[PDB]
């Protein structure tokens, strides 16, 4: 598809972070089975969602600098951006129907309970948050806030939990948890 | 409480791995929730005599043990059965809650095998891959006894078949770093 932006590490800020409107970024590379599976699907989506979504690709072999800035551990990974901010993430192979469902749910949009985690160490990552909160119930989204300049955790993140009771159980249990050398604060985001 | 065992790195093998159901509590002096739960342990230790042993491992005194079980914080409880991790519970909890946890783990879901993990793979990687697909109940990274490096494989347990299946269909062939993964239902 001629509608898909060919990203580079240098074009990322302009093409994604300053874009208006939703941008779906595909992290991929030539040595990757599921990349090849989803490539035709992304082409059809770029056509079928034109006017509501822009599709962008970043080859991580040629552009090794971006994926680490978003905690991206492998490929294929889809990141949905809105106004310069990650709204949602989808990892690995998927069907066209499944991609549409992801897009449609995240383009509509606020669902789940939001938890605020403060005083994370500079090495904290999405993995840490998944491992803390996942045992308590279904989590739909995790966001680690990273410093623009460093790529390190800026000291806080968020987790989104489907059911209120599970979220309050995680909060009651994880507040005060000492993760490495940092005692954590864990609360409902007001 | 005299019912507690006092673990050291050097006695871990003997007290935990070579012994036969124990609950290990990783803790330290600078830790709020550790103080909150330490009285609940003593109640459990006398209250579970015969059926379970409680032991403690101070992570300052004994800093070897934690990263060999991928423990990143305290407090963390690990339930071993015959030398392997059966279950884990992180953070503060009521007596009620620890009862629930011990009762149900003495005493499951769909078991997923992940193969070709790199040597630095940990439980966080697995939570992060599988968590988005729905309810995960347990993850286990298999480590080498000698290196404490991931041996190349792990397991995840997921409650709901359709979620497990979607995770398998999506994550098989995912390239995590320089390694392509196999993911399958365990047979
Ligand atoms: Na490539
Ligand atoms: Na939940
Ligand atoms: Na997600
Ligand atoms: Na599940």
DSSP secondary structure, A18-57, as one string: T-SSEEEEEEE-SS-HHHHHHHHHHHHHHHHTTTTEEEEE
Resolution number, Å = 2.0
Residues A94 and A19 placed together within one structural domain of the fold? yes
Q: How far is A153 from chain B (nearest CA, A)?
A: 16
Please check whether residues B132 and B170 belong to one and the same domain.
yes
From the list B32, B92, B176, which residue is nearest A73 (CB)?
A: B176
Specify whether B60 is located in the same domain as B150.
no
Ligand nearest to the CA of A142: 3
State phi, psi for A48 to the nearest 5 degrees: -75, -25
CA A58 to chain centre: 15
HSE (side-chain half, CA atoms, 13 Å) at B73: 27
By C-alpha distance, which of B12, B106, B22 is closest to B58? B12
CB contact (8 A) between residue A34 and residue B174: yes
Angle at B78 between CA B8 and CA B139, to 5 degrees: 130
Interface test with A, best of B136, B137, B173 (most A CBs within 10 A): B173
Do residues B99 and B128 both lie within one domain? no
Of B4, B19, B28, B31, catalytic: B31
Q: Which of B16, B22, B24, B34 is catalytic?
A: B34
Identify the helix (H) or strand (E) that includes residue B23.
strand B22-27
> Hey, are the CB atoms on B175 and A127 less than 8 Å from each other?
no
Distance from CA of A187 to the nearest CA of B (A): 14
Q: How far is CA B138 from the centre of its chain?
A: 8
| β-bridge partners, B90 | B76
Q: Which distant-in-sequence residues (6+ apart) come within 8 Å of A9 by Cβ?
A: A63, A64, A65, A66
Strand positions, DSSP E, A121-164: 139-146, 153-161
Residue B160: both structure tokens together:
């709901």
Q: Is A67 on the interface with B (CB under 8 A)?
A: no
Interface test with A, best of B128, B157, B179 (most A CBs within 10 A): B128
Same domain membership, residue B170 and residue B99: no
Cα A167 to averaged position of ligand 2 atoms, centre (Å): 6
A151 is written with which tokens?
A: 């790529």
DSSP tag of A184: P
Q: Same domain, yes or no, for A127 and A145? A: yes
Domain end among A60, A86, A110 = A110
Regarding whether B117 and B77 lie in a shared domain, the answer is no
Please calculate the CA angle A6-A14-A54 and round it to the nearest 5 degrees. Answer: 50
Q: Please give the positions of A annotated as active site.
A: 32, 35
CA distance B63 to B51: 28
**Do B134 and B176 belong to one domain?**
yes
The structure tokens listed for B154 are: 């792990």
Residue tagged 């800093």 (tokens) = B63
Residues in chain A with CB shorter than 8 Å from the CB of B177 are 73-74
B183 strand-pairing partners: B114
Same domain, A81 and A119: no
- B128/A126 touch (CB, cutoff 8 Å), yes or no: yes
Rounded-to-integer distance, Cα B157 and Cα B138, Å: 5
Considering the domain architecture, whether residues B116 and B98 belong to the same structural domain is answered as no
**Domain identity same for A2 and A73:** yes
Structure tokens at A2: 């001629």
Which among B10, B28, B136 has a CA at the least distance from the CA of B73?
B28
Contact B167, B158 (CB under 8 A): yes
DSSP per residue, B37-104: HHHHHHHHHHHTTTT-EEEEEETTT--SSGGGTT--EESEEEEEETTEEEEEEES---HHHHHHHHHH
Name the domain boundary from A110, A137, A160.
A110
Q: How many folded domains does chain B comprise?
A: 2
Contact B133, B112 (CB under 8 A): no
The answer to whether the Cα torsion of A112, A116, A120, A123 is positive or negative is: positive
Q: Is position B150 annotated as part of the catalytic site?
A: no
CB-CB contact of B57 with B65 (8 Å) = yes
Residue A156 Cα, ligand 2 centroid: separation in angstroms?
20
State the structure-solving technique: X-ray
From A127, A138, A173, residue closest to B124, measured CB to CB:
A127
Q: Which domain covers residue A73, as residue numbers?
A: 1-110
* A97 near B CB under 8 A: no
Question: Which residue among B36, B91, B131 places its CB closest to the CB of A134?
Answer: B131
Contact A11, A19 (CB under 8 A): no
- B44-62 in b/e burial notation, b at 16+ Cβ within 10 A? bbeebeeebbbbbbbbeeb
Cα dihedral angle (A38, A41, A45, A48), rounded to 10 degrees? 180
Q: How far is B28 from chain A (nearest CA, A)?
A: 10
Q: CB A174 to CB B32 under 8 A?
A: no
Q: Please report where in the chains the tokens 């599988």 appear, as a residue.
A: B130
Choosing from A78, A110, A142, the residue where a domain stops is A110
Residue B16 Cα distances to A58, A178, B22, B27, B65, angstroms: 48, 24, 7, 16, 11
How near does any CA of chain B get to the CA of A166, in Å? Answer: 12
Flag whether residue A84 sits within 8 Å of chain B, measured between CB atoms: no
Do residues B127 and A127 lie in contact, with contact meaning Cβ atoms separated by under 8 Å?
yes
Distance CA B22, CA B45 (A): 10
Ligand closest to Cα of B167 equals 4
Task: Write out the DSSP string of A57-126.
Answer: EEETTT--SHHHHTT--EESEEEEEETTEEEEEEES---HHHHHHHHHHHHH---SEEEEEES--TT--H
CATH number at residue B7: 3.40.30.10
Q: Which phi and psi (to 5°) does residue B10 adopt?
A: -60, -20
Q: Are residues B42 and B80 in the same domain?
A: yes
Look at the block and give the residue holding tokens 């864990």: A186
Total number of residues shown for chain A: 190
């Amino acid at each position: 598809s001629d509608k898909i932006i060919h990203l580079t590490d240098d074009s990322f800020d302009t093409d994604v972070l300053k874009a208006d409107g939703a941008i779906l970024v595909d992290f991929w590379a030539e040595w990757c089975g599921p990349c090849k599976m989803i490539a035709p699907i992304l082409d059809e989506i770029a056509d079928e969602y034109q006017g509501k979504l822009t599709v962008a690709k970043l080859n991580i072999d040629q552009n090794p600098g971006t994926a680490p800035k978003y905690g991206i551990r492998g490929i294929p990974t889809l990141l949905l951006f809105k106004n310069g901010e990650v709204a949602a993430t989808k990892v690995g192979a998927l069907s066209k129907g499944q991609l549409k469902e992801f897009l449609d749910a995240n383009l509509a949009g606020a669902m789940g309970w939001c938890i605020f985690i403060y005083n994370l160490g500079q090495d904290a990552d999405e993995g840490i948050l998944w491992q803390m909160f996942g045992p308590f119930g279904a989590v739909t989204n995790v966001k680690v806030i990273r410093d623009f300049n460093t790529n390190k955790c800026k000291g806080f993140g968020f987790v989104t939990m489907t059911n209120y009771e599970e979220a309050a159980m995680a909060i009651a249990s994880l507040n005060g948890y000492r993760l490495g050398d940092k005692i954590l604060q864990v609360s409902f985001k007001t």
